[PDB]
Amino acid sequence: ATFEIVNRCSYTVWAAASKGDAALDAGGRQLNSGESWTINVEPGTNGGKIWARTDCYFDDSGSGICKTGDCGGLLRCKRFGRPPTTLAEFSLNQYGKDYIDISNIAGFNVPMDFSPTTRGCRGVRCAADIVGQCPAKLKAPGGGCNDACTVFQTSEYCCTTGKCGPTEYSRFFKRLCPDAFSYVLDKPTTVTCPGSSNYRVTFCPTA
């Protein structure tokens, strides 16, 4: 499957793509404002994620740091990123269909549209100004809006027991972005797409 990753933000981002135990494609790349990077994701990828990273530095070997979304200091991510990270999430070719969502469960850093480029389903978007409106206790000094699990490490926010409800913090994310997951047990906003669809992830879609 092809994913075109487009940075419409006025700032550089470092895109990242991983399924947690491996890179997807090269796993990461710099995207200056306006740049597009097309990746190939193997059919059948389950639990893949794409995100943006901000305020990164890398040496000539591809090691460094990012202020949001840092994946073990690598340019070319093999693991998931450090919150806060707005997440484009997908599982492809799962019994004949693809499943896509946006999640704020690991916080928010950059606004996002995640849409098919092929027929048969709709996209999802989280493009509100969550960083600007972020509750004071959730603001990440390194940049972004943390989720409450990251900040407070409770069973209720992290949904550790499989039993949790919405919270004042989840409700903030949900109010700004109804179409994205706000906590683990949120009413799902997953879209079912034809199997083997192709996609576009746009950072700062309303930029």
Numbering used by the authors: 1 to 207
Q: What did the paper state?
A:
Among the sweet-tasting proteins, thaumatin is ~100,000 times sweeter than sucrose on a molar basis and about 1,600 times sweeter on a weight basis. The intensely sweet taste of thaumatin has been widely used not only as a natural sweetener, but also as a flavor enhancer and for masking unpleasant tastes in the food and pharmaceutical industries. Site-directed mutagenesis studies revealed that six lysine residues of Lys19, Lys49, Lys67, Lys106, Lys163, and Lys187, and three arginine residues of Arg76, Arg79, and Arg82 located on the cleft-containing side are responsible for sweetness, and two amino acids residues, Lys67 and Arg82, are particularly important for sweetness. In the present study, three mutant X-ray crystallographic structures of thaumatin (K78A, K106A, and K137A) were determined at resolutions of 1.07, 1.07 and 1.01 Å, respectively.
The threshold values of sweetness of K49A, K106A, and K163A were 140, 140, and 180 nM, respectively, which is about a 3.1- to 4-fold reduction of sweetness. The structure consists of 3,267 protein atoms including hydrogen atoms, 20 tartrate atoms, 18 glycerol atoms and 300 water molecules. The normalized B-factor ratio of Ala106 was 0.68 for main-chain and 0.72 for side-chain and those of Lys106 in recombinant thaumatin for main-chain and side-chain were 0.61 and 1.25, respectively. The normalized B-factor ratio decreased by 0.53 for side-chain, suggesting that the flexibility of side-chain was also reduced. Besides, the flexibility of Lys106 is substantially lower than that of Lys78 and Lys137 in wild type structure, suggesting that the lower flexibility of side-chain at interaction sites might not help support good complementarity with sweet receptor. The detailed structural assignment at an atomic level revealed no significant conformational changes in interaction sites of Ala106 as well as Arg82 were induced by mutation. With K106A thaumatin, the volume of positive charge from lysine residue was reduced but the distribution of charge was relatively small when compared to K78A and K137A. Compared to Lys78 and Lys137, Lys106 is not relatively exposed to the molecular surface. As to Lys106, it was 5.0 Å from CG of Asp173_T1R2, which also interacted with Arg82 in the length of 4.6 Å. Since the interaction to Asp173_T1R2 still is retained, substantial reduction of sweetness might not be induced by K106A.
